[PDB]
Design an enzyme around this catalytic site. Structure first.
Site, PDB file in Angstrom:
ATOM      1  CG  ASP A  21      36.190  36.912  46.200  1.00 26.48           C
ATOM      2  OD1 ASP A  21      36.736  38.296  46.243  1.00 26.48           O
ATOM      3  OD2 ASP A  21      36.980  36.056  46.065  1.00 26.48           O
ATOM      4  CB  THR A  22      34.925  43.195  46.217  1.00 24.01           C
ATOM      5  OG1 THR A  22      36.003  43.099  46.974  1.00 24.01           O
ATOM      6  CG2 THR A  22      33.739  43.419  47.040  1.00 24.01           C
ATOM      7  N   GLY A  23      36.957  40.876  44.959  1.00 20.97           N
ATOM      8  CA  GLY A  23      38.130  40.455  44.239  1.00 20.97           C
ATOM      9  C   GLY A  23      37.853  39.537  43.069  1.00 20.97           C
TER      10      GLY A  23
HETATM   11  O1  LIG Z   1      43.276  32.810  45.130  1.00 18.85           O
HETATM   12  C1  LIG Z   1      42.118  33.307  44.934  1.00 18.85           C
HETATM   13  C2  LIG Z   1      41.661  33.556  43.411  1.00 18.85           C
HETATM   14  O2  LIG Z   1      41.854  32.661  42.760  1.00 18.85           O
HETATM   15  N1  LIG Z   1      41.015  34.583  43.033  1.00 18.85           N
HETATM   16  C3  LIG Z   1      40.543  34.926  41.830  1.00 18.85           C
HETATM   17  C4  LIG Z   1      39.255  34.290  41.445  1.00 18.85           C
HETATM   18  C5  LIG Z   1      38.380  33.729  42.422  1.00 18.85           C
HETATM   19  C6  LIG Z   1      36.939  33.329  42.152  1.00 18.85           C
HETATM   20  C7  LIG Z   1      36.802  33.278  41.025  1.00 18.85           C
HETATM   21  C8  LIG Z   1      37.409  33.924  39.858  1.00 18.85           C
HETATM   22  C9  LIG Z   1      36.978  34.185  38.388  1.00 18.85           C
HETATM   23  O3  LIG Z   1      36.523  35.454  38.235  1.00 18.85           O
HETATM   24  C10 LIG Z   1      38.545  34.408  40.340  1.00 18.85           C
HETATM   25  C11 LIG Z   1      40.749  35.569  44.274  1.00 18.85           C
HETATM   26  C12 LIG Z   1      39.772  36.769  43.971  1.00 18.85           C
HETATM   27  N2  LIG Z   1      39.771  37.024  45.337  1.00 18.85           N
HETATM   28  C13 LIG Z   1      40.306  36.381  46.308  1.00 18.85           C
HETATM   29  C14 LIG Z   1      40.359  34.945  45.518  1.00 18.85           C
HETATM   30  N3  LIG Z   1      41.442  34.204  45.939  1.00 18.85           N
HETATM   31  C15 LIG Z   1      41.625  33.870  47.248  1.00 18.85           C
HETATM   32  C16 LIG Z   1      42.896  34.593  48.049  1.00 18.85           C
HETATM   33  C17 LIG Z   1      43.714  35.478  47.276  1.00 18.85           C
HETATM   34  C18 LIG Z   1      44.672  36.226  48.218  1.00 18.85           C
HETATM   35  C19 LIG Z   1      44.252  36.216  49.454  1.00 18.85           C
HETATM   36  C20 LIG Z   1      43.880  35.039  50.151  1.00 18.85           C
HETATM   37  C21 LIG Z   1      44.007  34.761  51.653  1.00 18.85           C
HETATM   38  O4  LIG Z   1      42.523  34.597  52.105  1.00 18.85           O
HETATM   39  C22 LIG Z   1      42.900  34.491  49.289  1.00 18.85           C
END
Ligand SMILES: O=C1C(=O)N(Cc2cccc(CO)c2)[C@H]2CNC[C@@H]2N1Cc1cccc(CO)c1
Ligand SMILES: [Cl-]
Ligand SMILES: [Cl-]
Ligand SMILES: [Cl-]
Lengths: 99, 99
Positions: free
Chosen positions: B25-27
């Site tokens: 997960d690059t996000g």
């Molecule tokens: O909801 C989250 C989320 O909370 N995070 C932040 C995150 C997630 C895990 C750990 C950390 C701590 O750094 C932060 C985002 C980041 N990428 C998608 C993580 N998502 C999932 C997401 C988002 C948009 C669209 C879709 C459709 O599928 C899925």
């Protein structure tokens, strides 16, 4: 390009004629942009986040540039922490993960 | 390897002597894993995004094997609906985005 992950992979996108910052997000199925005006009809879409589900607006066949690369596809609009380019458009522009 | 994004980029990881499936997960800045035992001290943290926030435990200096590549870093543990490998560990295996 090749983008490393020491910092957030933030890029410039163009949508609705305007430049915005967005995050290249392989953990997102879909592309989600902050509230803005987009043309046409929309449909509801539920997305599943780490903290729960949320309903957003789905617009189809929207013109969007990502890092200067032209694309046309589905864009969701809602209360996202940052603009998100998800797998639907990453695939379209030929983006892969490599190691 | 090269991983396309037609599907969720799920890989096998080994952590704390357990095998799990996790999303590259690059996000995500950080790595978050579903409830499991880990050694050492921890500190509480809130992480969140579009769907809300969850409370997690922060464990430092945890060894993980991701797709057979060994790394070490901070791992957050909590009620995440999906195991997430974030940038803090993606960098360590040499993972980049390419297009
Ligand atoms: O909801 C989250 C989320 O909370 N995070 C932040 C995150 C997630 C895990 C750990 C950390 C701590 O750094 C932060 C985002 C980041 N990428 C998608 C993580 N998502 C999932 C997401 C988002 C948009 C669209 C879709 C459709 O599928 C899925
Ligand atoms: Cl699309
Ligand atoms: Cl770390
Ligand atoms: Cl590097």
């Amino acid at each position: 390009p090749q983008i490393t992950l020491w910092k957030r992979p933030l890029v410039t996108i163009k949508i609705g004629g305007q430049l915005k910052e967005a995050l290249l997000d392989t953990g997102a199925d879909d592309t989600v942009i902050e509230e803005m005006s987009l043309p046409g009809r929309w449909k509801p879409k539920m997305i599943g986040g780490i903290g729960g589900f949320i309903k957003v607006r789905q617009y189809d066949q929207i013109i969007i540039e990502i890092c200067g690369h032209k694309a046309i596809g589905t864009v969701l609009v809602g209360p996202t922490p940052v603009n998100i380019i998800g797998r639907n458009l990453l695939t379209q522009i030929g983006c892969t993960l490599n190691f």
